[PDB]
Amino acid sequence: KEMPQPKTFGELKNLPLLNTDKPVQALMKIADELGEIFKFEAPGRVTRYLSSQRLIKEACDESRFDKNLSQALKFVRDFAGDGLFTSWTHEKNWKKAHNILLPSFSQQAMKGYHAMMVDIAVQLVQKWERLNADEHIEVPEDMTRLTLDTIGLCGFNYRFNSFYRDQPHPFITSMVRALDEAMNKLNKRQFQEDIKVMNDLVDKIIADRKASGEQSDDLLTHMLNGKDPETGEPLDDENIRYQIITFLIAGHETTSGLLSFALYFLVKNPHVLQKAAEEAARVLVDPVPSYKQVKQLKYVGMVLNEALRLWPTAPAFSLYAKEDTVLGGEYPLEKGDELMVLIPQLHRDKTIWGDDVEEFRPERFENPSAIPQHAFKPAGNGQRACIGQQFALHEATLVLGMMLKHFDFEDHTNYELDIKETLTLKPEGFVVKAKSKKIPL
Amino acid sequence: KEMPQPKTFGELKNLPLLNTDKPVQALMKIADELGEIFKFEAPGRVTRYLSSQRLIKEACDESRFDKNLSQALKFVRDFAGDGLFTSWTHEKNWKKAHNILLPSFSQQAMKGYHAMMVDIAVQLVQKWERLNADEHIEVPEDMTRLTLDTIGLCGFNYRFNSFYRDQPHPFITSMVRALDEAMNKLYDENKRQFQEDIKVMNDLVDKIIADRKASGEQSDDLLTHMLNGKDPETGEPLDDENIRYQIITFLIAGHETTSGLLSFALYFLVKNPHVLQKAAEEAARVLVDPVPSYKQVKQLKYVGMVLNEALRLWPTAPAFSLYAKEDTVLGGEYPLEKGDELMVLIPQLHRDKTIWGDDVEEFRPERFENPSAIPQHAFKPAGNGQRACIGQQFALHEATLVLGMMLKHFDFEDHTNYELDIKETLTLKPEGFVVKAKSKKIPL
Ligand code: HEM
Numbered sequence: 001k002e003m004p005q006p007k008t009f010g011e012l013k014n015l016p017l018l019n020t021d022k023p024v025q026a027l028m029k030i031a032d033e034l035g036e037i038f039k040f041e042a043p044g045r046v047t048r049y050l051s052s053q054r055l056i057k058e059a060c061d062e063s064r065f066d067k068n069l070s071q072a073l074k075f076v077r078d079f080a081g082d083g084l085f086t087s088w089t090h091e092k093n094w095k096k097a098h099n100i101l102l103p104s105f106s107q108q109a110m111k112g113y114h115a116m117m118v119d120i121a122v123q124l125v126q127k128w129e130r131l132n133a134d135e136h137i138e139v140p141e142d143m144t145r146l147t148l149d150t151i152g153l154c155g156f157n158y159r160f161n162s163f164y165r166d167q168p169h170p171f172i173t174s175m176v177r178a179l180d181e182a183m184n185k186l187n188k189r190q191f192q193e194d195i196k197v198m199n200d201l202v203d204k205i206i207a208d209r210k211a212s213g214e215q216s217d218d219l220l221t222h223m224l225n226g227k228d229p230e231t232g233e234p235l236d237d238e239n240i241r242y243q244i245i246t247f248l249i250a251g252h253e254t255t256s257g258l259l260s261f262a263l264y265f266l267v268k269n270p271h272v273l274q275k276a277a278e279e280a281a282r283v284l285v286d287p288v289p290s291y292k293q294v295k296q297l298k299y300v301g302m303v304l305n306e307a308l309r310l311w312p313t314a315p316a317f318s319l320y321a322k323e324d325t326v327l328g329g330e331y332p333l334e335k336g337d338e339l340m341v342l343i344p345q346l347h348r349d350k351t352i353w354g355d356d357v358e359e360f361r362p363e364r365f366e367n368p369s370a371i372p373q374h375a376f377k378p379a380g381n382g383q384r385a386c387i388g389q390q391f392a393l394h395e396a397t398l399v400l401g402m403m404l405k406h407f408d409f410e411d412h413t414n415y416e417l418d419i420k421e422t423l424t425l426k427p428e429g430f431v432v433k434a435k436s437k438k439i440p441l
Numbered sequence: 442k443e444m445p446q447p448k449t450f451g452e453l454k455n456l457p458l459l460n461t462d463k464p465v466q467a468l469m470k471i472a473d474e475l476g477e478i479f480k481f482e483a484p485g486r487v488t489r490y491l492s493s494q495r496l497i498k499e500a501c502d503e504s505r506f507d508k509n510l511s512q513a514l515k516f517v518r519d520f521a522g523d524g525l526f527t528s529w530t531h532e533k534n535w536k537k538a539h540n541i542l543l544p545s546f547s548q549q550a551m552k553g554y555h556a557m558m559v560d561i562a563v564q565l566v567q568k569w570e571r572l573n574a575d576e577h578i579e580v581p582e583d584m585t586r587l588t589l590d591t592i593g594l595c596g597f598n599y600r601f602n603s604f605y606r607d608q609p610h611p612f613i614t615s616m617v618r619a620l621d622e623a624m625n626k627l628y629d630e631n632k633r634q635f636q637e638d639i640k641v642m643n644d645l646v647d648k649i650i651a652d653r654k655a656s657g658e659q660s661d662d663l664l665t666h667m668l669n670g671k672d673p674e675t676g677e678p679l680d681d682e683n684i685r686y687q688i689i690t691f692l693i694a695g696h697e698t699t700s701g702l703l704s705f706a707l708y709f710l711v712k713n714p715h716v717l718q719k720a721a722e723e724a725a726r727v728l729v730d731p732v733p734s735y736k737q738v739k740q741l742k743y744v745g746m747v748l749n750e751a752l753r754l755w756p757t758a759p760a761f762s763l764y765a766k767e768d769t770v771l772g773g774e775y776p777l778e779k780g781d782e783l784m785v786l787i788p789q790l791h792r793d794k795t796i797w798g799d800d801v802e803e804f805r806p807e808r809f810e811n812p813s814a815i816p817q818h819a820f821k822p823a824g825n826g827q828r829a830c831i832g833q834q835f836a837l838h839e840a841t842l843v844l845g846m847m848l849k850h851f852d853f854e855d856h857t858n859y860e861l862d863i864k865e866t867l868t869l870k871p872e873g874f875v876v877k878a879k880s881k882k883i884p885l
């Protein structure tokens with residue numbers, strides 16, 4: 001009944017324990033030591049970190065707990081505003097935007113984003129095809145170039161052309177500078193300038209599209225044409241801007257991290273790589289993969305789910321108790337008390353996954369119906385789960401499938417995993433050499 | 442712009458594509474080929490079948506579309522008359538009965554029907570408790586015995602005593618034969634028999650109304666409510682003949698839709714043993730008294746989710762008809778003229794993958810864990826708007842109660858490895874579904 005709590009530093013409470021470049025990995029070690037629930041305090045704040053499926057399934061009951069705007073989300077809200085990710089569930093724009101955008105993020109909707117995803121995918125594979133013998137690839141760097149550009153094209157038909165440059169388009173620079181500044185807060189002049197660079201570009205694109213009247217296959221067209229069936233209202237131009245900035249912020253790094261971690265696990269487990277590469281060869285028989293072919297990349301999808309099991313790229317999400325309640329028959333909580341779900345620990349719960357939790361075994365996802373409810377939560381929970389989850393997996397399955405069709409990979413530095421933490425996780429410094437199989441592209 | 446339509450074969454039009462006694466299932470396969478809307482013609486008519494949530498939301502706009510009496514409903518009107526189910530919305534009795542009966546069908550009103558539901562539910566349990574080792578249960582048959590008797594007791598305090606008989610009470614025999622004849626019409630002896638079945642139904646129900654009025658007895662049934670209610674709008678009460686039509690209508694409209702729901706839920710539970718275990722775990726944790734209380738039925742959350750998921754896959758009154766009130770454009774692409782008919786294909790609506798995900802055929806009650814998050818007009822087992830099922834709270838309270846008791850008292854075996862066979866009439870049901878129950882020996 002008494003909750004464990006790690007070391008306290010007087011009036012600093014537990015804050016000093018997170019004065020580190022890798023706070024989630026430090027919290028996982030605290031979960032290692034204290035078990036399924038621990039208390040964590042900062043000067044005027046309290047949170048309880050949950051690690052076991054037993055307690056997390058109760059936390060995921062939406063009649064009892066709702067998404068909380070953590071301090072990180074409040075700082076990201078200075079530029080993400082009231083877009084989906086940084087809104088309270090009871091804010092009117094959360095509901096409006098959710099009802100309008102849901103159907104445009106469905107698996108069926110991926111069919112209309114497929115060609116633009118392929119356009120950027122092909123640009124990445126062609127870059128690697130064109131490398132000389134004395135060169136290597138910087139994985140996370142190229143995966144981020146890919147994901148940013150794909151979200152810019154599918155989101156608002158805008159080309160960042162990140163594969164044509166050494167220094168990123170100026171929006172990307174301000175966006176990543178903006179996000180790092182908000183994560184560092186856990187400058188002001190630079191922060192305000194970076195907000196303006198983001199709003200100026202996105203506002204201009206929205207004003208240009210409304211002027212032309214053109215209809216394309218992007219999310220902006222859907223937002224300009226959508227009407228919330230409940231209120232009957234469309235989103236205004238400011239909120240559309242925040243949704244756009246939000247797709248980029250929430251989707252670019254989580255998705256590039258997944259691709260980087262999946263390639264990492266594959267070069268470290270050659271037998272799994274070979275099985276995934278043999279599926280890619282059999283399925284992707286055309287020089288341009290089709291939507292239906294990506295859907296048949298089943299083992300590739302299993303590789304991606306297992307990479308997400310071990311290193312879910314948006315690793316913690318925050319909840320608040322809606323009313324007074326008791327968690328797991330043991331821990332009484334009051335209305336408003338906050339819970340943090342530590343996804344990487346949930347995904348290491350030996351009572352669900354077996355004792356081999358640290359092993360990379362995509363075969364765990366062979367039968368998706370066997371995974372207990374709330375045991376696997378890389379996309380968060382319920383109505384506040386990631387709306388971009390079908391987009392992210394289609395993109396990553398498409399791209400990983402193409403990589404495996406076209407190249408053999410070498411882990412030429414015997415890379416040592418070093419997980420860098422920002423809003424998201426990624427394998428910093430991960431580099432490979434790819435040798436082309438010379439297959440038509 | 443042009444409406445999709447299946448191949449036409451000269452003067453037979455699209456009729457050769459429905460050479461079946463299971464047209465909704467056949468129609469769902471055409472929706473799978475042609476999409477969210479298709480026109481369907483036969484020499485006699487023209488209708489448009491709608492399957493996506495996006496166009497069904499527009500068809501559900503009551504200022505543009507209203508309930509159409511299909512031909513089945515017109516044939517059923519010969520014995521259901523101007524009861525709520527077979528009336529046009531503009532008929533005076535529709536609006537008077539609607540206003541008067543709404544408060545007797547609310548959730549709150551279920552509190553007063555609860556004891557009578559419990560009465561018939563205990564008889565079903567006792568029947569199954571008393572079977573010998575070598576026996577099995579006919580599911581839709583017993584479920585239909587239960588619903589008819591529950592509707593009879595709660596509707597007009599009449600006991601059909603279906604669990605005491607091999608052959609139903611004469612009223613039931615006549616009602617079900619009258620219904621069958623109505624659907625089969627979609628013959629001189631059929632006609633004479635149909636007039637005899639109408640007289641059996643009317644004579645009994647008229648006699649019971651008259652006995653009630655002559656005694657002044659006040660009971661907990663819908664008949665008392667209709668004898669004493671007055672429409673707040675016109676200030677008038679229902680007359681005796683209309684009261685007879687609503688009693689027949691409750692039985693017609695409620696018996697097989699509700700029995701079909703229970704049968705399909707038990708079918709999905711025995712084909713999905715992990716779900717059945719989770720549901721039975723809730724029934725054991727919640728139903729701690731000898732017989733369930735109203736409050737206990739309301740706390741059977743997972744049991745209600747199982748029932749909703751069964752209604753998502755196989756909505757037991759699967760299609761409803763609408764007519765355009767005025768000229769209008771549907772979905773910004775399809776112009777309709779006043780009077781044009783639409784059919785809502787409920788099971789196909791319920792498989793719209795943009796709403797529910799790609800896994801639409803799976804039985805997963807957890808899809809209903811947070812009802813408020815299901816998109817508007819995505820789940821429509823009770824029809825739409827002011828013409829929606831007035832008996833919906835009654836049917837869900839009954840089913841939740843009965844399935845909760847089933848799961849409390851017995852373990853179930855799908856001893857024939859039953860192959861799902863969906864018979865279509867006015868409703869759906871798993872024809873021939875059979876099971877063995879093993880008592881948990883928990884006394885009532
Ligand atoms: C593998 C990649 C991804 C992962 C692991 C991921 C993870 C998550 C998680 C854990 C949440 C919930 C956060 C919370 O509870 O506070 C979330 C929400 C969200 N994500 Fe993703 N995400 C991914 C990709 C994307 C993409 C590609 C997009 C957009 C194109 C996107 C847009 C969003 C949005 C808009 C929300 C908020 C939804 C709402 O609350 O209504 N994400 N994501």
Ligand code: HEM
Nearest residue numbers: 525526691694695698699758761823824828830831832836
């Ligand atoms: C799960 C069981 C049930 C289902 C799936 C169901 C379904 C429906 C549907 C879809 C409609 C609309 C028909 C149309 O638009 O043509 C309807 C109407 C109706 N149902 Fe139900 N029903 C069920 C149970 C009941 C019960 C138990 C009763 C009575 C005790 C009942 C009585 C009625 C009546 C009177 C109407 C006509 C309402 C009006 O138009 O004013 N139903 N039902």
